[model samples]
Target: NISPWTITGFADADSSFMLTVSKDSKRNTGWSVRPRFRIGLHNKDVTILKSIREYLGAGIITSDIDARIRFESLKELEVVINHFDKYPLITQKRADYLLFKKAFYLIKNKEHLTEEGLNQILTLKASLNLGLSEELKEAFPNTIPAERLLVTGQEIPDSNWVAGFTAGEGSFYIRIAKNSTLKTGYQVQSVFQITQDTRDIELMKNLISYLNCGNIRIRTCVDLVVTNLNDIKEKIIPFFNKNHIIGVKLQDYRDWCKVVTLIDNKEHLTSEGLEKIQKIKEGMNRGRS
Candidate 1:
């Protein structure tokens, strides 16, 4: 039921575009180049991957602790290519996709069978994800990474895309801690955030105005944190509430809203309400049963 741009934003938020060159004795060049695109989430949200597959009419959903959707073959990769080419990616992920697509064309044309073609792939691989692995570094000392493309200060897309992006990257958290100053001896804080690669700091920065709340923080990855109760009540919560986050994260949002409700009414300041909030937090995020 989701739109293609939503899937685009979802992948920009949490997917991986990789160009892997592995040793293969059966291959003419003794190396096999694999261009892969993947998005993996918690097992609870596997249905989201299924929806994406249905939307794309390609890829496969994997059965594992971390549920996954993957596209690897040249044919399917073309589908993904056509998708992003139309919807377009405004995040740093666009850089990786371009690099991976570059390699995909080479391998599609059998360019990887030549030593120079393999070298060119090694160069592209060096800039794709976290760069080349230790094994690759040891194998190709002279490999210079491809020129990296920068994605910065790009305007955030549609509300639907934001909703889709949040489905993959957003988090809602309720922090309950001991506080002797409070009558209940506890402090409860509700938080909403979305994390992305540091390279896209400017892109995330633009989102600040998009939602008109939250502040950016750095730590590989940057994030936007919105913890103010008013912001949550008037902006963050309402925005997602309208756009709709379709995933297990939606369950988390529902739970988060419950806490937000308690906090808004000053109910979390009471002993009984504190206990209820505690129970809710226990089943959230990684604490889910």
Candidate 2:
């Protein structure tokens, strides 16, 4: 069974939070503002998007340029808000979630109906995403942009958070190359990695701690990588087995696990095992092509 925490983990990776302000003659401030949470995927993954809609029991899935599942209604949006509140977001996006929650609360309380409340919402809106539009800047010349709150403390992230983060940023890799030193004439290596900007280096460090395996490397980006076969067999694989991945990444994870199993049994040393691993590898990540 797929757990809500697993879904939350995937959402943490793939979802977005948006606050929109539009000119509306019906409102006191000549604006209509609303909040939306969206998860978009390729057309091939429309089935996965539909599954997410069913899992939340809210939102709608549309097949526009891409498949998108969105929560726009206040009630449906609340469902997402509540889940995140409970599971909580641990990345920079957490700040956006906090802002989105604040705006939702203000709107729900009918504060947007008054000039003072509208201005307050506008300030909050200015801090989110790409910030306020030029039209909004002209409308609320006196607005003070809200400052983004920094995520504090060293609280260890939970399994659900890891799963969600992985859905968004994780990768499963199988490397095969010629090696004259090996009897099999080829060397196979398996790696599971997650990459994020340097800003989330602490989170990556914390992930290494969470899994009790892997190491972080800094280059153009920060990466938490587990390449040790034993670590993958004993730590990384088992964790996902219980928690599970919820998106197309799940297929990659399964294929990765199969390769790990083969490697564990020393099958990677055989021509047959190398060919089998190659077949599974072909279907993974960007190799789906």
Candidate 3:
């Protein structure tokens, strides 16, 4: 069983807070506003998404190209609000969450119906990721843009939070490469990594310090990676083992742990061990394809 913190942490990694403005013929200003919270996952995890819906007592599960579970209605969004209000979010997303909460309150008070209220909502929307749309820009030409809020004084995340975050964003990879120097003529390397947008570089760096292992690399995205076998065996594996992953990634984690064990025992040096490692590697990450 997973705790509420686990769910919150998972949401921190995978959830999105969105505000949509669309033209509405039925509305006074020919505009409609929508606030939605959504989490999308691979279809393989539909069962877990359903469990999350049941756990929250809100949202609906739908599948298009991907499985999406969302809480959009005001009443259902309350359930989401209550959960986060207690557990709270520790990443930069916390700022977005707070902004989303404010927008919800505005809608609850029927503020979106008035020009002033719509402008206020527009300001809040400006502070969120991707900011205002061109449509909103045209509608509110005089609206003042609001700066995105900086998240400060955030508490350090615990192991449970890390595990849950990993469930959504973490990856277990086993790489096999030809090596002339190795006895088996092949080398097996395993890595535990998580990728996030550059905006969360502080959070990713904090994760590196939190785990007391791993390092951060930047490209188009930020990556927190633990590649040293000893670090994975001593720090990375033990952390997840204690807190545990509660989603489909749990299967990948088990396979990864097995590969670690084989390498720990010097099995990767033998032809038979190399074959065994290849078999396990085949089932992980995009390897299923």
Q: Name the candidate that leads on lDDT.
A: 1
Model 2's TM-score against the true structure: 0.85
Worst 10-residue stretch by lDDT in candidate 3? 148-157
Candidate 2 lDDT tens digits, 70-165: 889989988998888776777777888888889999999999888888888888888887888898898789789888887655454567667766
Rank by lDDT, highest first.
1, 3, 2
TM-score of 1: 0.93
* lDDT scores of the candidates, listed in order: 0.87, 0.82, 0.85
Better of 1 and 3 by lDDT: 1
Q: Write the per-residue lDDT of candidate 3 for residues 158-221, one digit (tens) a residue.
A: 7788887899889998888898988889888889999987777767777878889888888888
Clashing pairs in 3: none
TM-score of each: 0.93, 0.85, 0.93
Assess candidate 1 and give its lDDT: 0.87
Q: Local error of candidate 1 at 215, Å?
A: 1.9
lDDT of prediction 3: 0.85
